[PDB]
Structure formats: C-alpha cells, structure tokens
C-alpha cells in the first residue's frame, strides 16, 4: 500500500459504493 493517510471524520463523499459501471469497490479491500 502507498504512504498516503487520510484522517478526520468519515463523511458522505468519503463513502465507497458499487460504481455506476458496476465495480464493487468494497470487494477489493483485501487485495
């Protein structure tokens, strides 16, 4: 993984959801 660190309160727009072209990004966390 990259040395990039988001911090703070998780808000709407920090959400991960299935993309409009159907990629279930929430399946990919364990990759």
């Amino acid at each position: 993984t990259a040395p990039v660190r988001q911090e703070g309160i998780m808000t709407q727009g920090d959400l991960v959801t299935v993309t409009s072209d159907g990629i279930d990004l929430n399946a990919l966390w364990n990759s």
Partner: protein, 231 residues
C-alpha cells in the same frame, strides 16, 4: 489513492460551531473539498468570503468524486438554500492552504533592451527591461489567446515583477534569455498561523484584510480558533 482531502477531525456543534444555509451555490470545481473562509450576507445565509459581517468561520464542503475524479451536482450540501455546518473551534486534518487561480514571480536579469515571456506556452513578443507594470500587463494580455485585461493583475515594478491570475488554466513561463519565472506555489507549513481573506481563501499571509483562523502544529493539521471579524 493518489490524493487526500481536507476534513474536520474534531468538530463539536454545541460550542458556537453553527448550522446555516448557503446564500449562493458552491463552485464544486474550485471550492469543493477545500478550507473556505466564510461570512454571512444581509440575509441569514452563509457566503464564501466576507459577507456583511466579515469572516466568521471555516467551512469544508465534503462532496464525493467518482473513480475518474468527477463530482456529482445532485448533492444536498452545495446549492443556495442547502444546509451546511460552519466551524470556529476544532481541528482540520489533511489541511492545505486554499487559493483561487495562479501567481508567478518574474525576475529579469537582462541589463538593457528586451526579453520574451511565454503566456500559456506562446510568446508575448518583446517585453523591454524596466517596463512599467501596465506595459508588462499589456504585453501579456496582447497575446493571441482568450485571456483578457481582467484575467490578470501585475505588480512589482522593480526587476522583481509579480503576476496574479484569477483563473487556474494559465501558466506563465520564461522564453527569451535574461528572464526567469517561478510559479509561487503554496503548501501547508508546520508551526504556522493561517488567515482567512475576503475572497474566501485561507493562507499563511495576513495582508491588509486577513482574519486569524488558526495555526498548524504538524503541517497536515490545523487547530481552528477563529477570531471572528468585527467592525
């Protein structure tokens, strides 16, 4: 992913960190996911930059992008009359100075005669040594592109010129010999004070209009403590 976005880390809501409604639409391409200085207009409504009251707080419009980096306009926190949270007391992580448009430092080393700048990768033609600020501005806006007498400000009549631009899509760079140009970038600094401005921008410089909004600690963080603007 390649990027981090400014966010409230601590924000309480019972401490004079206030709800209001926007007086205007937020410009998502310029103002989403950024630390905006805000006031209130003659209605009860939140505006970016100074309103009637001056600068009263900081705001982050935390919208979401897709995997291609586009942002949806169907959101409920962006338009005039949408509700939004404003802060005076709290902490922002992944902090960045918030600035609109571009600025360039021009140092001319030609001791006589003429030099050429390249505005948007194409030449001004000759700019003389020791030109007035208005003549350098003329020689920039004379270029055969879409950028006008009001897309620019120019100042610093000594060999040290400074160019300021309203729009993001103009680069100014050197072309002829005896001239050097540096883009004046802005990045968060550790252990530094930050200031709101009437524009809505937030940066490390108190000019003539700056309102103290907070200070950093480590560069990625800002401790928010807005000393509210007054008459």
């Amino acid at each position: 992913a390649l990027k981090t976005k400014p966010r409230w880390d601590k924000y309480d809501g019972y401490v004079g960190n206030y709800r209001g409604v926007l007086g205007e639409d937020i410009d998502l391409d310029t103002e989403a996911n950024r630390v905006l200085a805000v006031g209130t207009n003659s209605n009860g409504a939140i505006v970016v930059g100074a309103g009637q009251t001056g600068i009263k707080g900081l705001m982050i419009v935390a919208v979401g992008a897709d995997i291609h980096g586009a942002m949806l306009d169907g959101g409920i926190n962006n338009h005039a009359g949408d509700p939004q949270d404003v802060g005076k007391h709290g902490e922002i992580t992944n902090f960045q100075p918030t600035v609109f448009g571009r600025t360039f430092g021009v140092a001319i080393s030609a001791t006589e005669g003429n030099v050429k700048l390249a505005v948007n990768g194409v030449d001004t033609g000759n700019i003389a040594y020791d030109t007035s600020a208005a003549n350098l501005k003329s020689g920039i806006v004379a270029v055969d592109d879409g950028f006008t007498a009001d897309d620019f400000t120019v100042t610093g009549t000594a060999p040290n010129f400074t160019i300021v631009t309203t729009r993001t899509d103009v680069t100014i760079t050197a072309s002829g010999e005896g001239v050097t140009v540096t883009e004046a970038t802005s990045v968060a600094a550790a252990g530094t004070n930050y200031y709101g401005h009437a524009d809505g921008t937030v940066n490390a410089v108190k000019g003539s209009d700056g309102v103290y909004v907070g200070h950093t600690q480590e560069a990625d963080r800002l401790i928010v403590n807005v000393k509210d603007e007054e008459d």
